[PDB]
C-alpha cells in the first residue's frame, strides 16, 4: 500500500555523475513535457554586490548570440533567476529536444568570455531593474554603485571559478530517456578551478534564528513544523508577526526570519508551544499527513518535483529516506529546538 507507493517513486528517481557534473533524474511515463533545470552554485549571498545576478544576464550571450532567442525559435521558453545561493536556468520542452537544448544551454553557461559592450549593456538593463521579498530582490540585484565596481576581469574570473560542471547540478524531470555524456559533451567543459568552497556572506532590523537538531532532512521538517505552529498560534491570538524562512540547499541548518520589532510576540509564542502537552504531538501527526498528501499531489507537476529536489536534495536522498526523516520527528525534537530558540532570543 503506502510502502508500494514510496517504492514506486524511488524506482523512477535516480542520480548519477555525467562527465564532471551530476544529473538528478525523475522519469514520468507519458508525460507531455520534460523539465530541465541547470542550477549553478552561486547566488546573491556569494557576493553582496549583485555579481551573481549580473552573471546571470551575461550568461545569455555567446559570440553575439542570445540563447533566449535561440530557445524561442526552437519553441522553448528559457527562464533564469538568481536566488540567495544558486542561479537557475529552467526550461520545458518535449523530450525529443531535451538533449540538444540542454547541450546548447551548457554551451552558453560554460562560455567564459564577455566583451565590454555586452557588460555595459547588461549593467544598464540591471540598473533599470534596480530603479524599477523586496530586500531579497534588492540584495540579489545589488545596487547601481555595487555593480558599477565590477568589470570584465571580475566577471570572467567568477565565471571560470563558479560556472563549472563540478559546481553545477542538473535536474531532468519527465520522460523516460536517460542523460549521458555522449549526448551532452559539454558536461566535461571544466576550467582550472574546482568546486568553490561554500562561503556564505549573510548580512539589521531582523533576526535569524537557527533550526539545527538532527540531520539535513530533519532540520527542514522541524523548521516547517515550528513555523506552522507559530503562525497558527499567532492567528488565534491575532499576533501580527511575519515568520520568514531561510532554507537553502547548501545549508545544513534551517533558519526562521522574524522582524526585530515582532520579537517579543514571537518569543511569547515559542514559550507558548510547550504549554499544551498534546498540541505538539497532534500537530506533528497532522503535519506528517499533510506533508504526504502534498507530496502525492505535487509529484504530478514538474516544477513542484523540482522544488523537492532543491529543498530536500531528492535524488541524493530517496523518497523513503524523506518519509523516514518525517516519521522520526517527535515532540522531543520540537522541545529541543524550542529551548535553543529561547536561548537565542534570550541573548
Amino acid at each position: 500500500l503506502n510502502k508500494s507507493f514510496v517504492k514506486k517513486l524511488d524506482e523512477s528517481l535516480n542520480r548519477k555523475q555525467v562527465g564532471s557534473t551530476n544529473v538528478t533524474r525523475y522519469k514520468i511515463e507519458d508525460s507531455y513535457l520534460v523539465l530541465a533545470a541547470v542550477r549553478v552554485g552561486i547566488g546573491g549571498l556569494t557576493y553582496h554586490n549583485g555579481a551573481a545576478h549580473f552573471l546571470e544576464h551575461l550568461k545569455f550571450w555567446r559570440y553575439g548570440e542570445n540563447i533566449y532567442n535561440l530557445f524561442f525559435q526552437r519553441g522553448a521558453i528559457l527562464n533564469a533567476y538568481t536566488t540567495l545561493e544558486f542561479t537557475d536556468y529552467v526550461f520545458l520542452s518535449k523530450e525529443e529536444s531535451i538533449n540538444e537544448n540542454l547541450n546548447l544551454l551548457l554551451t552558453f553557461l560554460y562560455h567564459h568570455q564577455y566583451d565590454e559592450k555586452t557588460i555595459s549593456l547588461e549593467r544598464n538593463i540591471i540598473i533599470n531593474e534596480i530603479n524599477g521579498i523586496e530586500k531579497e530582490r534588492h540584495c540579489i540585484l545589488g545596487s547601481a554603485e555595487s555593480i558599477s565596481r565590477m568589470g570584465r576581469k571580475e566577471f570572467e574570473l567568477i565565471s571560470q571559478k563558479y560556472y563549472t560542471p563540478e559546481n553545477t547540478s542538473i535536474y531532468v524531470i519527465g520522460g523516460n530517456q536517460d542523460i549521458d555524456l555522449f549526448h551532452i559533451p559539454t558536461a566535461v567543459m571544466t576550467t582550472q578551478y574546482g568546486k568553490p568552497t561554500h562561503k556564505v556572506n549573510v548580512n539589521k532590523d531582523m533576526i535569524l534564528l537557527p533550526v539545527e537538531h538532527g540531520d539535513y532532512l530533519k532540520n527542514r521538517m522541524i523548521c516547517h513544523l515550528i513555523a506552522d505552529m507559530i503562525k497558527h498560534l499567532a492567528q488565534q491570538l491575532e499576533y501580527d508577526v511575519s515568520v520568514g524562512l531561510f532554507i537553502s540547499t547548501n545549508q545544513h541548518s534551517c533558519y526562521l526570519k522574524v522582524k526585530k520589532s515582532d520579537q517579543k510576540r514571537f518569543s511569547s509564542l515559542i514559550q507558548q508551544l510547550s504549554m499544551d502537552e498534546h498540541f505538539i504531538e497532534t500537530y506533528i501527526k497532522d503535519y506528517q499527513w499533510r506533508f504526504m498528501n502534498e507530496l502525492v499531489i505535487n509529484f504530478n507537476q514538474l516544477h513542484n518535483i523540482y522544488d523537492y529536489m532543491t529543498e530536500y536534495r531528492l535524488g541524493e536522498y530517496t523518497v523513503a529516506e524523506l518519509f523516514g526523516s518525517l516519521d522520526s520527528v517527535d515532540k522531543l525534537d520540537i522541545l529541543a529546538v524550542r529551548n535553543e530558540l529561547i536561548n537565542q532570543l534570550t541573548v
Binding site: 511515463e29 502525492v296 499531489i297 507537476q301
Partner: protein, 371 residues
C-alpha cells in the same frame, strides 16, 4: 451501470485518481433568477462536505457551480490516492452522495457568514481590476446585460442582501447535485473514462451595442479595445483564435509589441465565453488607438512564424495537460474528439495559415474603453 465507458488511452499516469460529475443546468446563467443564492449555498455545501469527505484516501474534494460557455453546471470532484497505494479504499459515488445528504443544517449556518464574505470579496476583486475592468465595462455595454460582465460572479447588491433563511433552499440544491442527470469522468491508470456521449451546446452572447465608446473621466491612463469574429467554429474558438491572440500580443516579439515599441505594458486576451478579443495598453493613448486599429486592420501572417505559434500553443496545451486538474477541465469543456488531448494536439499541428486569413476576414472591431 453507466450507459457507456468511453476510455481515452495514452493519458499521462498521475499519482492520484479523479472521479468527477458534471450536472447540467440547461437554462443560461443569465436566466437563473436565484443565481446569487445558488452560488452561496454551493460554497456553504462544499465547505461542510469537505470536512467530512477530505479524509484519507481523499486528498481534495471539489464542489462548485461553474459557468461553461454561458451555462451553469454543478461540478463535483474527488481526488484520491489509488487503492493500490492507499491504506484505505475510497468511498463510492453512492457514499459520497449519502455524505452530501447527511449534511446538517447547523453546519451550513455556521458557514453562512464566512462563505458570504468569501463570495462578496470575489465579486469586488473581479470588478476592481486595473486592466480587466475595462473589458468588464465593454462586455456590459456590448451585450446590454451586466450578467456577462460585472455580475458574472454575482451581483453585489443581490449577494450582500442575502440572509440565513437561504438554508431552506438547501434541500433543492442537494437534490440537484445528487439526483440531477450528468456525466461522470474518471481518470485512472493512464486513461480517461467518460460515462456517456453528450456535448452541451455552447452559447455565445450576441453583441447588441456595436461600436461602443467608454468615454470615462478619472485621474491617475489605460485603453482597451474589443474585437469579435463571425462564423466562429469549434476549431477557431479553441485553437485558432487562442493562437491568434498569442501571435499578436503574447508570443515574444508580438505584432503589438513591435508596433507600439515605435512610440515607446501591453496585454491581450481572447474571451471564449463572450467571443471577444481584448487588447489592453497602459495623451499618448490617442496615437496608440489609431496605431493599434490600423495594425489590426493591416494584419499579415507567414508560414514560418505561424509554425512557431503552433509549437508554442501546443506546448502551452501540453503544460495544461501536465496538471491533472488542467486535464480534467479540458476533457469536461471540449466537444467531440477535442476531449482527447492527443486529438486536440493533432488538431493544433494540422492548422494552416489559410485558417488565419479566414479569421482575419471575419474579424471586426466592436468597442473601445479608455480611462
Amino acid at each position: 451501470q453507466d450507459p457507456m465507458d468511453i476510455k481515452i488511452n495514452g493519458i499521462k499516469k498521475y499519482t492520484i485518481h479523479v472521479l468527477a460529475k458534471v450536472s447540467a443546468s440547461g437554462m443560461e446563467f443569465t436566466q437563473e433568477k436565484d443565481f446569487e443564492h445558488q452560488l452561496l449555498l454551493t460554497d456553504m455545501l462544499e465547505t461542510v462536505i469537505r470536512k467530512s469527505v477530505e479524509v484519507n484516501p481523499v486528498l481534495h474534494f471539489h464542489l462548485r457551480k461553474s459557468i461553461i460557455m454561458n451555462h451553469s453546471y454543478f461540478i463535483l470532484g474527488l481526488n484520491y490516492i489509488p487503492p493500490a497505494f492507499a491504506t484505505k479504499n475510497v468511498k463510492s459515488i453512492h457514499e459520497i452522495y449519502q455524505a452530501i445528504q447527511d449534511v446538517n443544517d447547523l453546519q451550513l449556518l455556521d458557514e453562512f457568514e464566512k462563505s458570504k464574505e468569501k463570495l462578496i470579496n470575489k465579486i469586488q476583486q473581479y470588478k476592481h481590476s486595473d486592466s480587466h475592468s475595462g473589458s468588464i465595462r465593454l462586455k456590459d455595454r456590448l451585450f446590454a446585460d451586466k450578467k456577462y460582465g460585472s455580475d458574472r460572479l454575482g451581483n453585489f447588491e443581490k449577494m450582500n442582501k442575502i440572509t440565513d433563511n437561504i438554508i431552506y433552499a438547501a434541500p433543492d440544491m442537494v437534490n440537484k447535485i445528487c439526483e440531477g442527470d450528468g456525466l461522470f469522468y474518471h481518470i485512472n491508470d493512464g486513461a480517461i473514462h467518460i460515462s456517456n456521449i453528450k456535448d452541451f451546446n455552447y452559447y455565445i452572447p450576441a453583441v447588441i451595442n456595436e461600436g461602443v465608446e467608454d468615454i470615462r473621466t478619472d485621474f491617475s491612463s489605460i485603453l482597451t479595445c474589443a474585437y469579435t469574429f463571425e462564423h466562429v467554429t469549434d476549431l477557431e474558438r479553441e485553437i485558432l483564435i487562442p493562437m491568434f491572440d498569442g501571435y499578436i500580443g503574447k508570443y515574444g516579439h508580438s505584432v503589438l509589441f513591435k508596433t507600439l515599441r515605435l512610440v515607446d505594458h501591453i496585454s491581450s486576451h481572447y474571451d471564449q465565453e463572450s467571443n471577444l478579443l481584448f487588447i489592453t495598453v497602459l495623451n499618448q493613448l490617442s496615437t496608440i488607438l489609431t496605431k493599434i486599429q490600423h495594425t489590426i486592420e493591416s494584419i499579415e501572417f507567414d508560414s514560418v512564424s505561424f509554425s512557431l505559434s503552433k509549437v508554442m500553443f501546443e506546448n502551452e496545451s501540453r503544460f495544461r495537460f501536465e496538471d491533472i486538474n488542467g486535464l480534467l477541465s479540458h476533457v469536461i469543456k471540449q466537444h467531440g474528439e477535442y476531449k482527447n488531448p492527443e486529438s486536440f494536439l493533432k488538431a493544433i499541428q494540422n492548422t494552416d495559415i489559410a485558417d488565419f486569413y479566414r479569421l482575419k476576414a471575419n474579424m471586426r472591431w466592436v468597442g473601445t474603453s479608455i480611462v
